[PDB]
Design a protein around this ligand. Structure first.
Ligand SMILES: CCCCCCCCCCCCCCCCCC(=O)OC[C@H](COP(=O)([O-])OCC(O)COP(=O)([O-])OC[C@@H](COC(=O)CCCCCCCCCCCCCCCCC)OC(=O)CCCCCCCCCCCCCCCCC)OC(=O)CCCCCCCCCCCCCCCCC
Ligand SMILES: CCCCCCCCCCCCCCCCCC(=O)OC[C@H](COP(=O)([O-])OCC(O)COP(=O)([O-])OC[C@@H](COC(=O)CCCCCCCCCCCCCCCCC)OC(=O)CCCCCCCCCCCCCCCCC)OC(=O)CCCCCCCCCCCCCCCCC
Ligand SMILES: CCCCCCCCCCCCCCCCCC(=O)OC[C@H](COP(=O)([O-])OCC(O)COP(=O)([O-])OC[C@@H](COC(=O)CCCCCCCCCCCCCCCCC)OC(=O)CCCCCCCCCCCCCCCCC)OC(=O)CCCCCCCCCCCCCCCCC
Ligand SMILES: CCCCCCCCCCCCCCCCCC(=O)OC[C@H](COP(=O)([O-])OCC[N+](C)(C)C)OC(=O)CCCCCCCCCCCCCCCCC
Ligand SMILES: CCCCCCCCCCCCCCCCCC(=O)OC[C@H](COP(=O)([O-])OCC[N+](C)(C)C)OC(=O)CCCCCCCCCCCCCCCCC
Ligand SMILES: CCCCCCCCCCCCCCCCCC(=O)OC[C@H](COP(=O)([O-])OCC[N+](C)(C)C)OC(=O)CCCCCCCCCCCCCCCCC
Ligand SMILES: CCCCCCCC/C=C\CCCCCCCC(=O)OC[C@H](COP(=O)(O)OCCN)OC(=O)CCCCCCC/C=C\CCCCCCCC
Ligand code: HEM
Ligand code: HEM
Ligand SMILES: COC1=C(OC)C(=O)C(CC=C(C)C)=C(C)C1=O
Ligand SMILES: COC1=C(OC)C(=O)C(CC=C(C)C)=C(C)C1=O
Lengths: 68, 54, 354, 454, 79, 84, 176, 95
């Protein structure tokens, strides 16, 4: 009779959740690599090509006409 | 008025007000100032000497 | 199984403080069963060799065939409405913070649904459907030779219809199995309440929650019956009733309304793969929105300002998708995508201490 | 991985063990200790293994009758004399080794040597004493009068060594016990209790020179040698099952599972000692300072969690070594319904040695192995057993420093190499008594010696 | 070298309550001694398997309760 | 005695590095499973690759002459131009 | 073997950082660049965005707690394992009042009502759970460090548990 | 299920198989409670909907007003885009 006596639970009381950690790492990895591709192809790459093409005004060794 | 500090947390992120976190504590925790009313519980009692009286 | 049913329906305890937004899931399950049944029955009269002429023969010659045809099309719209609203709810109450397993099981069903709906559109064998698949299939045109293996020819033909039809017949039954895995986790991992904490206010399901859940489903039925018989809302594009002509391109190659968010993403980004990749991000990043947090809180029942701006981002992108590719809409839509990335970063980022 | 040397200065501070061979061939080994009590005895290289099938049991009978009177004393006189010296005479008989040792005070050391020599060399095997002991031995022979740990210890040898004499028991079969006579015992004394096979061990306030002089005088007339033992091939290990299913003896089941071990002198013997330590022992009724649920022992910890009740009421590892073979395994006493989990976990533990054994568990096991070995050398009898058992097994006594030096080299990788070579995918022998519906077939348990993972 | 003690250390007091090193008898062979060298009734060697814990075994006594159940309450599907 | 306590507190300071080591040791013990995976993949994906790469992947052991007498494309049995 | 070399690298790199002071216990002077940033941006940003936004949210949160009649610490969900381990050891007096407040809050929220204003003049941000949260974290950290420092191997799918770590039977789908 | 302290059962009677989920949602009530109620057959079943009607809709509209400023910024952007599209079309074409 009376309220239950307080007692700590014998642990460890955490663990067994590696599938959730896998999903975290897979999702972060995929989305981190999507950021690189989208940042490159949609912003960096275009601007880089323009610079190189305006760096061809120097035309010390611009690409040859034939060289097929 | 309410004793909470609205700006207790900073940085990018969604706004939250809470008192607690899950972060691990150091081997040698900062000695709490119990004389001024600071709390001493858990790691800052065991791994500190704030409890010793003369 | 009777004891199982009694344990999961008759003696199942749920909090008495839940809203009608906790009835959306019941509706999905019921409307899903209706879509399978009507699909199987329609199959009794359909010839997938020409589904343009087959749909005509159902609506004109079969007795009450018009009911089957329009229910199967309109109940799809309904399925996606209820599902998308079920996600909006789960985001608002952040029901993924402690019940991630339930969230994962649901996302699997979302992926399956996205495939079922698209292929069902192509079974209609109309202009829009033909050209739409011809555009999507050409996104995996980089993977060498895979277009040919999926299509079965160098261009979409009945060969492609005969194989996608089997995926459309079978994949829904698997979805129903994942629904069991979903209801399994819900019953073990107790449902979330309108309040952030856990309270001893639970009541049995059959005597109370099912009566309320039926009031909800019957409310939706009244509205769905009006659409089913009078087309109060245009939920099906008219250009799917034009006979396929491979030589002429449709006025606008757009998907159904429930694929316009991802259609816009693909029409806004300047590189084809970047667009495909940003569609992956949309359906993958939302599965890790609580993983990096470190505070003992579920970020629940705040003003949810970030949530509101996300729900509007979805609606606004669907609008841009309807609109033709006017340059102005593309610039504005690219800003909406940048804003979505930022809102999603806000959810993900843990906070430092002052 | 190597973490340094654990040898200390205190390990070198021990009195040396002096071993000298008398001209007749008897080795005399002594160690001085600052004690007021001593232990002097004879550790012989005799036992049941060196008996024939028809004579099995003679050695045990002789050991029970050797102190019942000599040709120069009587049982009452002998018992009176020992009591007056404030001493006690002990003796044991095993498969490969035997001993007759007295625990006395300092003044009783030499007098006890005389008493033991008379018993060993001039035993008066009176018929009346034999007949009374025949009854006592027969009663003990009854399995109803034997514990289940004694029964499974014997049956493990019966199952594993069907082809050689190591399978024989010490007490012997009841047919032989019924027929043993004085002539049998006299023959056994003549053939086996010879000087070349005896070691006189004296531990305590003793002087090697004095002990040697007394030993030569008292054991002058011992038979110098007997013919060399017949050369035999390695004892064949038979992977068999000998289970005594009995659902009328209570709820507790006793199961012993054995692998083929290594001989005493094998380079891998210390590795097997450490592996035995890693397995350890656990009793639900004596759990210690650390509970099972939070034990560093992996077998104990996983077992304590099974069904929220625990699948090991008791278990212990065992590492038994003989001159040319050995047995390595575990013994379980557990609830009937828990047997499948219990044997499965302990086999998973032994299989883990070959895949995933942590440095932490090894280092803990080294310390508890050294804490058990050193504590056994506390009293004179413990030292005397160590000297006599180690000279018979190795021809010399390994120092505590040498044991620690060799143990330092053994690490997790060395345990893994030895286990992979000898215990992985290895043949096993299962023996059991009790309610054993849950015990599977031998082939089913033998597949648990390897993993699909890793 | 040989191991002369069980792998499970007793951890209990050797001398019994009220008994001293003077009045405990001879601990090597006294019946009440907790360290009495066992009897070789059937030979030497069985001590490597013997359970030296004095308390008789209670089959199935629970030791894996982390405080999740009261005594006498039967867990159902681990809950 | 605080010195003893300091060491006993500090013996677990580097938990994150020990748990990382344990998982790396698991990952090391899974590395050998590649020897069966990678070849099994190429075995299943062999027909996807072009004839030129099929020959390199096999170190010349496979070539067009090794295609079955009754090739899955009947018009290309015995070569791309047929037997004769 | 290249694994044996990596094991030495890891062993030597960790031996060289034993006893290091954590980043938060080092007296740190902000970089001059950060100081300039914290004198231009931080002030204006607080006066125009952060300050007002976070006061707007905080005041709303206090009102919501007052309407429910609950404290801030009542709002914690016991599905969090630190909260559960703390709730094991709270005294009965705190426990009783905590339950009654949470019960009243759920009744009011379910019935779409609010606490009478007469009962709303209290400070909802009193941290009554703090002592027990800290004790629970200490207990969990000891268990983590002394009992969970390695990915242990166990027999899989036995005794109603997957063998991958969880301790409750029939707590996964594959363990039904 | 609920916390292990909450689902810990005082009784020794076995959990019925059909009530597994029910007893995994048990709570250990601290201090006690006195729950009361009346059958719906002896009560007004629609009045409370009317009684709570004003407060329900007041507290709903006051919370939903939080989104007003967000809503206005988004509509301003919608109008700006619409006009930008129209002027751009009239500029590219429309002589
Ligand atoms: C060029 C190449 C480029 C490659 C790029 C990269 C590609 C990556 C692909 C990755 C695919 C798999 C991803 C999930 C792996 C999970 C692994 C794991 O161990 O999980 C256990 C884990 C359980 O966690 P735990 O509790 O820690 O484990 C302890 C217990 O013992 C756990 O036991 P338990 O019983 O509690 O849980 C087990 C559960 C786990 O099983 C599951 O729940 C799912 C298992 C299968 C994987 C997911 C499949 C997704 C399928 C979607 C629908 C496809 C329809 C296709 C139709 C085709 C028609 C022709 O089992 C079951 O449900 C019963 C079976 O499960 C989860 O939490 C994850 C479930 C999956 C969630 C979604 C993940 C998405 C990740 C990728 C981003 C999104 C892309 C979307 C594309 C959509 C296109 C339409
Ligand atoms: C070519 C184009 C490419 C384009 C780009 C492509 C980019 C995308 C592709 C690349 C993606 C990279 C992804 C990287 C992931 C990294 C994950 C990571 O860091 O793991 C740390 C993480 C540790 O996390 P933690 O939180 O520190 O510890 C977990 C526990 O909370 C605390 O656990 P504990 O340590 O305290 O407890 C010990 C227990 C912990 O064990 C676990 O937690 C394991 C959980 C298993 C979950 C799955 C259950 C069974 C399958 C369900 C159905 C799935 C479908 O561990 C063990 O028992 C150790 C041995 C485990 C293996 C036993 C033998 C094999 C059994 C196989 C079944 O460990 C794992 O994730 C282990 C793997 C578990 C998931 C396996 C999924 C396999 C694939 C399925 C599909
Ligand atoms: C190069 C020729 C040479 O020295 O060969 C001996 C060299 C060492 O032989 P070992 O000392 O007997 O060690 C055996 C282990 O393979 C030794 O390898 P482990 O135990 O370190 O296993 C990891 C192995 C394999 O690692 C992976 O496969 C990585 C997988 C990541 C996912 O990674 C490596 O071999 C080293 C990777 C690090 C950079 C140095 C590369 C050389 O051979 C190899 O390790 C490669 C052949 C292995 C057998 C292939 C069948
Ligand atoms: C598009 C490319 C896709 C490539 C996919 C490649 C798939 C390859 C699948 C291989 C088998 C995987 C089985 C599950 C993982 C092992 C789990 C495990 O170890 O469990 C431990 C558990 C526990 O074992 P343990 O290791 O603890 O040992 C305990 C003791 N004994 C051994 C007695 C049990 O073991 C099992 O229960 C697993 C048994 C092995 C199951 C193997 C199934 C093989 C099925 C056929 C494979 C066909 C390959 C096709 C390749 C196609 C390529 C395109
Ligand atoms: C040590 C000796 C190794 C010798 C290897 C030789 C391989 C020859 C392969 C070859 O030429 O195949 C021809 C085939 C087909 O070429 P082909 O069609 O011109 O045919 C060769 C010419 N005839 C027909 C006369 C035989 O090409 C390949 O398969 C090329 C494979 C190249 C792979 C390169 C991988 C680089 C990875 C870099 C990673 C880091 C950045
Ligand atoms: C280090 C070794 C360096 C020397 C390598 C020489 C390689 C010669 C390759 C060659 O000419 O192939 C032409 C062959 C055949 O040329 P082909 O395509 O013109 O066809 C031949 C048929 N006739 C002549 C009738 C037209 O082409 C290939 O094999 C192309 C793929 C390259 C194969 C992989 C690289 C070489 C692998 C060498 C392995 C060396 C180990 C020992 C041998 C093992 C196999 C038996
Ligand atoms: C459990 C997990 C199970 C996973 C099982 C995975 C199965 C993978 C099967 C891959 C089959 C690849 C194709 C094999 C085959 O027979 O190819 C037929 C045919 C041969 O065509 P060719 O005229 O030689 O010209 C094309 C370029 N060479 O090629 C194809 O069909 C290629 C299809 C490629 C699909 C790639 C998918 C990634
Ligand atoms: C997740 C469940 C399902 C959804 C979301 C789905 C979706 C749809 C869609 C959007 C259509 C196009 C309707 C139109 O032409 O406008 C369609 C067509 C069709 N579906 Fe389903 N479907 C489901 C399951 C099924 C099932 C189980 C079957 C039965 C095998 C089926 C049979 C058919 C048939 C025969 C058609 C072509 C006739 C038609 O155009 O109406 N469907 N489906
Ligand atoms: C085929 C579509 C699906 C159906 C049949 C369905 C069904 C249900 C059911 C019946 C419920 C319990 C009742 C409820 O609280 O409303 C529920 C809960 C839940 N579902 Fe789904 N669902 C589906 C889609 C999804 C998706 C796509 C997600 C993830 C984005 C998801 C995540 C969740 C979550 C987190 C809960 C728990 C909510 C709470 O905590 O109570 N569901 N679902
Ligand atoms: C990411 O998945 C999606 C949703 O769920 C969050 C949506 O709400 C919406 C928006 C739905 C409506 C009814 C406007 C769509 C289309 C979507 O793609
Ligand atoms: C016809 O056009 C269609 C799109 O256009 C790009 C889509 O994005 C989508 C959505 C695609 C994914 C991967 C979510 C579909 C299904 C579609 O039919």
């Amino acid at each position: 009779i009376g309220p239950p006596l307080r007692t700590a639970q014998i642990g460890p009381t955490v663990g067994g959740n590696g599938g959730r950690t896998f999903v975290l790492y897979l999702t972060t990895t995929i989305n981190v690599l999507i950021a690189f591709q989208v940042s490159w192809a949609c912003y960096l790459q275009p601007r880089w090509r323009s610079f190189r093409s305006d760096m061809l005004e120097k035309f010390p060794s611009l690409q040859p006409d034939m060289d097929e | 008025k309410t004793r909470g500090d609205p700006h207790i947390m900073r940085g990018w992120g969604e706004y939250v007000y809470c008192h607690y976190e899950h972060l691990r504590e150091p081997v040698f925790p900062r000695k709490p100032d119990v004389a001024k009313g600071e709390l001493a519980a858990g790691a800052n009692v065991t791994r500190t000497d704030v409890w010793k009286r003369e | 199984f009777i004891l199982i049913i009694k344990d999961n329906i008759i003696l199942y305890n749920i909090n008495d403080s839940i809203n009608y937004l906790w009835n959306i899931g019941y509706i999905i399950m019921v409307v899903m069963i209706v879509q399978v049944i009507t699909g199987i029955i329609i199959n009794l009269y359909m010839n997938i060799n020409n589904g343009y002429k087959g749909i005509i023969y159902i609506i004109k010659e079969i007795y009450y065939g018009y009911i089957l045809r329009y229910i199967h099309n309109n109940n799809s719209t309904l399925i996606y409405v209820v599902v998308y609203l079920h996600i909006i709810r789960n985001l608002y109450y952040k029901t993924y913070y402690y019940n991630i397993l339930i969230w994962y099981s649901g996302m699997i069903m979302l992926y399956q649904l996205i495939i079922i709906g698209f292929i069902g559109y192509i079974l209609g064998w109309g202009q829009l459907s033909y050209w739409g698949i011809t555009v999507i299939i050409n996104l995996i045109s980089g993977i060498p030779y895979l277009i040919l293996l999926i299509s079965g020819n160098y261009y979409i033909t009945i060969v492609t219809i005969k194989r996608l039809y089997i995926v459309h017949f079978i994949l829904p039954i698997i979805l129903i199995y994942v629904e069991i895995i979903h209801v399994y986790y819900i019953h073990y991992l107790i449902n979330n309440n309108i309040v952030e904490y856990n309270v001893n206010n639970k009541i049995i399901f059959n005597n109370y929650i099912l009566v309320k859940d039926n009031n909800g489903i019957i409310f939706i039925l009244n509205i769905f019956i009006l659409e089913l018989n009078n087309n109060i809302f245009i939920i099906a594009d008219n250009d799917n009733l034009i006979e396929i002509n491979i030589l002429v391109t449709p006025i606008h190659i757009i998907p159904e309304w429930y694929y316009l968010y991802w259609y816009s993403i693909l029409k806004l980004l300047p590189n084809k793969y970047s667009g495909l990749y940003i569609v992956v991000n949309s359906i993958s990043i939302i599965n890790i929105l609580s993983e990096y947090k470190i505070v003992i809180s579920e970020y629940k029942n705040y003003k949810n300002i970030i949530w509101y701006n996300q729900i509007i981002q979805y609606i606004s992108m669907i609008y841009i998708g309807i609109q033709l590719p006017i340059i102005e809409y593309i610039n504005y839509g690219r800003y909406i995508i940048i804003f979505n990335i930022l809102l999603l970063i806000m959810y993900l980022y843990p906070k430092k201490k002052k | 991985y190597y973490w340094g040397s654990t040898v200390t200065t205190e390990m070198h501070n021990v009195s040396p063990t002096q071993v000298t061979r008398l001209p007749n061939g008897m080795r005399v080994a002594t160690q001085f200790s600052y004690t007021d009590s001593a232990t002097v005895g004879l550790w012989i290289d005799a036992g049941a293994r060196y008996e024939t099938k028809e004579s099995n049991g003679t050695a045990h009978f002789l050991e029970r009758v050797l102190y019942l009177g000599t040709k120069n004393r009587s049982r009452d006189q002998l018992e009176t004399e020992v009591e007056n010296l404030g001493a006690n005479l002990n003796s044991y008989t095993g498969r490969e080794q035997t001993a007759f040792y007295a625990k006395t005070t300092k003044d009783g050391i030499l007098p006890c040597i005389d008493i033991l020599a008379d018993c060993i060399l001039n035993p008066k095997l009176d018929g009346d004493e034999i007949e009374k002991e025949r009854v006592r031995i027969t009663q003990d022979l009854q399995a109803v009068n034997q514990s289940y740990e004694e029964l499974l210890y014997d049956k493990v040898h019966t199952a594993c060594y069907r082809d050689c004499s190591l399978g024989q028991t010490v007490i012997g079969p009841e047919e032989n016990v019924a027929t043993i006579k004085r002539d049998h015992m006299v023959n056994y004394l003549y053939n086996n209790f010879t000087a070349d096979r005896m070691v006189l061990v004296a531990v305590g306030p003793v002087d090697h020179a004095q002990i040697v002089k007394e030993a030569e005088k008292k054991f002058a007339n011992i038979r110098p040698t007997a013919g060399p033992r017949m050369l035999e091939e390695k004892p064949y290990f038979c992977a068999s099952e000998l289970v005594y299913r009995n659902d009328d003896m209570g709820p507790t089941a006793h199961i012993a599972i054995a692998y083929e071990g290594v001989p005493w002198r094998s380079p891998d013997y210390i590795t097997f000692m450490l592996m035995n330590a890693i397995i350890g022992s656990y009793d639900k009724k004596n759990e210690g300072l650390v509970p099972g649920l939070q034990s560093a022992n992996r077998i104990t910890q996983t077992g304590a969690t099974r069904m929220d009740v625990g699948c090991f009421d008791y278990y212990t590892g065992f590492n038994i070594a003989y001159k040319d073979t050995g047995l390595f395994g575990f013994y379980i006493a557990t609830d009937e319904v828990a047997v499948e989990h219990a044997v499965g976990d302990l086999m998973f533990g032994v299989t883990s040695f070959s895949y995933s054994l942590t440095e932490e568990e090894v280092m803990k096991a080294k310390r508890e192995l050294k804490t058990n070995f050193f504590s056994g050398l506390d009293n004179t009898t413990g030292v005397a057993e160590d000297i006599g058992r180690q000279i018979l097994a190795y021809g010399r006594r390994l120092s505590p420093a040498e044991f620690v030096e060799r143990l330092d080299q053994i690490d997790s990788q060395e345990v893994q190499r030895v286990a992979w070579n000898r215990l992985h995918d290895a043949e096993i022998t299962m023996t059991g008594v009790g309610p054993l519906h849950g015990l599977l077939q031998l082939w089913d348990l033998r597949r648990q010696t390897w993993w699909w993972r890793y | 070298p040989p191991i002369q003690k069980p792998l499970l250390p007793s951890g209990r007091a050797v001398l019994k309550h009220g008994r001293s090193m003077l009045c405990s008898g001879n601990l090597s062979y006294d019946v009440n001694s907790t360290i009495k060298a066992p009897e070789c009734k059937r030979g030497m060697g069985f001590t490597q398997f013997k359970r030296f814990t004095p308390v008789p075994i209670e089959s199935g006594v629970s030791v894996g309760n982390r405080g999740w159940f009261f005594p006498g309450v039967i867990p159902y599907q681990g809950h | 005695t605080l010195a003893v306590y300091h060491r006993l507190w500090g013996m677990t300071e580097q938990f994150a590095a020990r748990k990382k080591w344990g998982w790396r040791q698991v990952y090391h013990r899974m590395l050998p499973f590649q020897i069966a995976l990678y070849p099994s993949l190429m075995w299943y994906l062999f027909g996807w690759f072009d004839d030129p790469y099929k020959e390199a992947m096999t170190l010349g052991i496979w070539n067009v002459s090794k295609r079955s007498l009754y090739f899955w494309d009947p018009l290309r049995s015995g070569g791309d131009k047929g037997w004769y | 073997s290249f694994h044996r070399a990596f094991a030495r690298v890891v062993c030597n790199y960790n031996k060289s950082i034993e006893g290091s002071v954590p980043w938060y216990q080092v007296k740190r002077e902000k970089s001059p660049f950060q100081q300039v940033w914290d004198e231009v941006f931080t002030p204006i940003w607080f006066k125009l965005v952060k300050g007002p936004y976070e006061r707007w949210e905080y005041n709303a949160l206090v009102a919501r707690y007052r309407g429910m009649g609950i404290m801030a610490d009542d709002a914690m969900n016991d599905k969090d394992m630190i909260v559960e381990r703390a709730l094991d050891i709270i005294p009965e007096d705190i426990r009783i009042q905590r339950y009654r407040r949470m019960m009243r809050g759920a009744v009011l929220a379910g019935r779409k009502l609010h606490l009478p204003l007469e009962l709303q003049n209290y400070d909802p941000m009193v941290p009554y759970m703090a002592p027990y949260i800290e004790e629970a974290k200490f207990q969990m950290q000891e268990e983590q460090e002394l009992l969970a420092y390695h990915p242990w191997d166990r027999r899989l799918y036995t005794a109603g548990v997957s063998g991958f770590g969880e301790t409750s039977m029939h707590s996964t789908f594959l363990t039904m | 299920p609920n916390t292990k302290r909450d689902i810990r059962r005082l009784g020794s009677y076995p959990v019925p198989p059909e009530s597994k989920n029910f007893w995994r949602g048990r709570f250990q009530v601290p201090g006690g409670q006195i729950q009361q109620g009346v059958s719906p057959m002896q009560q007004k079943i629609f009045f409370q909907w009317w009684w709570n009607l004003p407060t329900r809709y007041f507290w709903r509209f006051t919370k939903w007003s939080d989104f007003l400023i967000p809503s206005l910024m988004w509509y301003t952007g919608f109008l700006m885009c619409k006009n930008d599209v129209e002027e751009g079309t009239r500029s590219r074409y429309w002589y």
